[PDB]
């Protein structure tokens, strides 16, 4: 016994923080958290696969930002793509300035 289990990881600690900013008093369940984790992992793997395919098509060897932006514009539908691009550019600009 004595624990001896592969320590598993998830995004449960990060989802809870986001919920508190968007709605202050609500709460979430374990099944909903597991569904959100699967959704995040699926979006992550979709973005990664699209970026890798773009990099292999353009005969490049590094996945830089412009690649993720094109992957987002190709995957996300309408105004969600524009909003995600705007927020990503804001985050990249803040990270470059600081």
């Amino acid at each position: 016994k004595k624990r001896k289990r592969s320590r598993k990881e998830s995004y449960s600690v990060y989802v809870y923080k986001v919920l508190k900013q968007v709605h202050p008093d609500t709460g979430i369940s374990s099944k909903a958290m597991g569904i959100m984790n699967s959704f995040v992992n699926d979006i992550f793997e979709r973005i990664a696969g699209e970026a890798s395919r773009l990099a292999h098509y353009n005969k490049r060897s590094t996945i830089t930002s412009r690649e993720i932006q094109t992957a987002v514009r190709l995957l996300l539908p309408g105004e969600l793509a524009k909003h995600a691009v705007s927020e990503g550019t804001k985050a990249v600009t803040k990270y470059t300035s600081a």
Binding site: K31, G34, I35, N37, S38, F39, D42
Partner: protein, 83 residues
């Protein structure tokens, strides 16, 4: 392990409840057999993929992860059990 009675397990009343949720008022009498047939056809492929994944994993226990990986190959993705 009875062939006929294991398929006959999906009883006529149950199939009615699955059609009332979809929005069906009147149901014929020759729908249940074809529904059981389509269910068998789907389950055969799903279980084939799951058993193939289990045999490739060198194990004798089918897991929810293997079931999800088998379902994702056919197209439909399930969020909830496993992940």
């Amino acid at each position: 392990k009875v062939l006929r009675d294991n398929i006959q397990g999906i009883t006529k009343p149950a199939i009615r409840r699955l059609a009332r949720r979809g929005g069906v008022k009147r149901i014929s009498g020759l729908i249940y057999e074809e529904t059981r047939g389509v269910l068998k056809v789907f389950l055969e492929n799903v279980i084939r993929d799951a058993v193939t994944y289990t045999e490739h994993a060198k194990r004798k226990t089918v897991t929810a992860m293997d079931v999800v990986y088998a379902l994702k190959r056919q197209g439909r993705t399930l969020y909830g059990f496993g992940g």
